[PDB]
Design a protein around this ligand. Structure first.
Ligand SMILES: [Mg+2]
Length: 282
């Protein structure tokens, strides 16, 4: 693979930091005026990125439509993703409101609730079938339906009920539980298997609203998930798979939200994931 030739070249000359820095320099800058309004201060996770105004998800509410979430719309790949922050103690209702309004089928969580001895997001889903969650502010009920714990990820079936209409939807919660506290995984194998499990569920498919993806504040992961998924899809779609340039795809995604890949090591890992994923697929 041409991408693998490039990978080996970057590795040999040790230019990951340089490549990464060039992408950072070239990355889009758009306003986040709404995110920065004083009334939204408590809706933003500290140390997390802000959503661009142009691509932010709006809650269907008259009072305050703000949530820290962005729609990444990949035109050529025909994939969309919503990237959002880990829910805060006071934005869990907003989070599930977004899932409801956007008709998402899946939520992809790429962090543990506690990492490095610190809380990374609110416990925003119920942990026991018999202890459902009611979000009074957005009038939603959330029930754990089933939970399947595997070595590298957990998948949960949740039932989300709009208490206003009594309509219910099944949401799949895909929780990658083994991303290390520091650095990146040594091998992309489990992360790729996880992505394939999300794909197989239909959560990324066009019949549903965009998958909602989140991780921990300011440290990426979510971008790697979407970047890998889109690159692999494009390799299956294009007449010339070798023309798929991860840097170009990343820059395209970066038009929709900042902080997709946060370190040079994450950039390297993303290459590694696409390379290994491509070998598995084609
Ligand atoms: Mg029990």
């Amino acid at each position: 693979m041409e991408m693998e030739k490039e990978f080996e070249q970057i590795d040999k000359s040790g230019s990951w930091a340089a490549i990464y820095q060039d992408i950072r320099h070239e990355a889009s800058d758009f306003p986040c005026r709404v995110a920065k309004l004083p009334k939204n201060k408590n809706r933003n996770r500290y140390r997390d990125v802000s959503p661009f105004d142009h691509s932010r998800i709006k809650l269907h509410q008259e009072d305050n439509d703000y949530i820290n979430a962005s729609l990444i719309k990949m035109e050529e790949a025909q994939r969309s993703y919503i990237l959002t922050q880990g829910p805060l103690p006071n934005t869990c209702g907003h989070f599930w409101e977004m899932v409801w309004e956007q008709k998402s089928r899946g939520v992809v969580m790429l962090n543990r609730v506690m990492e490095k001895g610190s809380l990374k997001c609110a416990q925003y889903w119920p942990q026991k079938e018999e202890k459902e969650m009611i979000f009074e502010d957005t009038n939603l009920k959330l029930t754990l339906i089933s939970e399947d714990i595997k070595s590298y990820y957990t998948v949960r079936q949740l039932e989300l009920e709009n208490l206003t209409t009594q309509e219910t939807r099944e949401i799949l919660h895909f929780h990658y539980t083994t991303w290390p506290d520091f650095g990146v995984p040594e091998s992309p194998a489990s992360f790729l298997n996880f992505l394939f499990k999300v794909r197989e569920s239909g959560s990324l498919s066009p019949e549903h609203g965009p998958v909602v993806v989140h991780c921990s504040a300011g440290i990426g992961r979510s971008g790697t998930f979407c970047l890998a998924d889109t690159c692999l899809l494009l390799m299956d779609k294009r007449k010339d798979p070798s023309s798929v340039d991860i840097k170009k795809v990343l820059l395209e995604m970066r038009k929709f939200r900042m902080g997709l890949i946060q370190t040079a090591d994450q950039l390297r890992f993303s290459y590694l994931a696409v390379i290994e994923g491509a070998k598995f697929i084609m």
